[PDB]
From a paper:
The surfaces of most bacteria and archaea are covered with a proteinaceous coat, the surface or S-layer, which is formed through the self-assembly of individual protein subunits into a regularly spaced, two-dimensional array. In [name], the S-layer largely consists of a major [name], SlpA, which assembles into a paracrystalline array enveloping the cell. The major protein of the [name] S-layer, SlpA, is post-translationally cleaved into two S-layer proteins (SLPs): the high molecular weight (HMW) and low molecular weight (LMW), herein referred to as [name] and [name], respectively. These subunits then form a complex (referred to as H/L) that is incorporated in the S-layer.
Our H/L structural model reveals three distinct regions: a pseudo-threefold symmetric [name] tile, an intricate LID/HID interacting motif and a third region composed of two domains, D1 and D2, of [name]. These regions define two separate planes, with the [name] spanning ~35 Å above the [name] plane, linked by the LID/HID motif. [name] protrudes from the interacting domains, with D1 closest to the [name] plane and D2 extending outwards at an angle of ~120°, away from the long axis of D1. Conformational flexibility in the organisation of SlpA is further demonstrated by different arrangements observed in the structure of a truncated derivative of SlpA ([name]/HID) and the H/L complex. The calculated rotation angle of the centres of mass of the D1-D2 region relative to LID/HID of 166° suggests a high degree of flexibility of these regions, at least in the absence of the CWB2-containing [name] core, with minimal effects on the fold of each individual domain. The strikingly different arrangements of the D1-D2 domains in [name], relative to the interacting domains observed in the H/L and [name]/HID structures, are consistent with this proposed flexibility.
Residue numbers in the entry:
A (entry chain A): 3 to 315
B (entry chain B): 1 to 219, 224 to 373
Write the structure that this text describes.
Amino acid sequence: TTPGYTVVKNDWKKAVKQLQDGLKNKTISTIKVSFNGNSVGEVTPASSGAKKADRDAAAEKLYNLVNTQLDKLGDGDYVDFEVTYNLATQIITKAEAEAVLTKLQQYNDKVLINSATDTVKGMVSDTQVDSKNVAANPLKVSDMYTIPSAITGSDDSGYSIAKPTEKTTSLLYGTVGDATAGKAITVDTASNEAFAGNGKVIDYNKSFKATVQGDGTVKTSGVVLKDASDMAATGTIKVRVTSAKEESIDVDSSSYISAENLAKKYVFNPKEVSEAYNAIVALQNDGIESDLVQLVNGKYQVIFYPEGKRLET
Amino acid sequence: ADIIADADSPAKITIKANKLKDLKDYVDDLKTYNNTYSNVVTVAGEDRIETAIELSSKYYNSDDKNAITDDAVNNIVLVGSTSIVDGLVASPLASEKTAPLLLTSKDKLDSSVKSEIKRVMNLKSDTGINTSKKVYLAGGVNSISKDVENELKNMGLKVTRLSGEDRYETSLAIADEIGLDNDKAFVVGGTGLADAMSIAPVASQLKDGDATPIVVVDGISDDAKSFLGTSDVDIIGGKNSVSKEIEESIDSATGKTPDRISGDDRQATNAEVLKEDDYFKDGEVVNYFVAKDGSTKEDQLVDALAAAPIAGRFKESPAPIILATDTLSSDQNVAVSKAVPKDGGTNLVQVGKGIASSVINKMKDLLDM
Ligand SMILES: CC(=O)N[C@@H]1[C@@H](O)[C@H](O)[C@@H](CO)O[C@H]1O
């Protein structure tokens, strides 16, 4: 009945590495550690993790504190973490920001609006011939925006991408062979922003697009962001490691242990199994979310921890 | 999203599927098979006397999930290990007195039952056995000898004996102890016992801690006429056992026209008892007991004797006994399928192990377990 996350022993390094990376990018402020239910310390970067050296020191302190305990973990033992986090404060390394910068610069030559025909709308000159619209060359992203060449920042505070500087065009959007003149194309200031981590990524579905409006004019977007994940912005997460072993039951596999041989092997808490069953049905029929049933890697799944083994007969 | 697991659990099981189709199916099968290995059990010793004790061990003064009592008991009912007629009338008595029904050999008190009497009443050398600690002897010196009676007294125990010189008045003696505090009474004949065992778990069902007595007629004695003052009566068995003449003897002596529950076979009347609504409500029977019918040997109905009061006090929904040694009859097959609710059954208890595996499997399918 306690929310959190449970790690099998064999995966402890994987999980610890995650906490370390969290500390290094200013996402985690403090971690409170305890062995078999007893507090044995607390890891916290000095001065709100302002310096890279202090953040790296906390990451090391964590591994040093727990590695021998975890590697020597036996039946019944367990290590509990209490992770206080805030995704807004996340920062990015020099290599991370320079890796995004290159992928942004590939959109420099992308076409926003094509040229118009007599039958489809596109770029048309701002001046007409015989009082009727003629076509113009397509609109590049380089015409409306100037993407930066380099990055800005330091190792202590993090690195950043400046928002591409906005530009104007005097060309228009309309149909070739229409009396009515083409309508203006302008940038959307509310759709061009700088990038420096902060729990976000580049939204390539909405970035560098031309969007027609109700009155017929066109607005263009620049660098648009989106949440890296749908988890809450801040809070404190509990993580446990035990000596249990992990078993994978894929019913779509060629071979897999049947439900009969599973009850043969283990005893399960009856309330826990029916709560899962009921959660599946409420999703199937009514579309009700449930923490018990999740969709991960294109497979819906439930998680059981059995009471123990079933005694032979 | 997830949860903080119990540190003593040995495994982290993740079940995966493309369509929550197949996931629902796997969890549904698990929900049932999990309940099966926990709640489908055999209770048998290697002797009729020894099987009756194993029932006592599991359900009286026990830590079991479905124990009648988890503390010591004050009363005990004792019946001769061969006298089936006696402990059939005695099953209601054991239910009302909150007592296990145990079996003994006529000559001498057996070693095994003697130790179980101590365990179930919590008898110790450092505590005084006071007057509340009693043993009922259902039957005369014919079934349970005078020697055994004195062996019990010499332990420092109280032994009331309900009996007579014949089967008809011993049953009267037992029925007189049982509370005839409401208008029901079951009637059976001296012959046709397998008709009668089917009603033992029903008579053992309690209303305000009152059991329903049964009387054994000849198919009336003047003693039985006074005993059955203006009672609604249900006759269990065929006419072969209770004539329509003695059905009228009851109609006249009481003033009540009695009802009859009967079948062609002993397994048919078993099925008829289940399908009676006053006995078990339709679509609400989740707990079942299985015991030998005596087709191969009439002497094996003894095992149903000790299980009848436990089944009639089981959980909060009573249980019938399905009589079947080698096979189940079609009548029993359909009656069970109608008794069970949509969801399925919750408990199956095999009493004794002279019952064929075929029969237990048929039960499991009928009940979705
Ligand atoms: C297994 C687990 O939950 N790990 C957490 C994750 O939930 C959180 O989002 C992240 C900070 O970004 O810190 C990780 O340690």
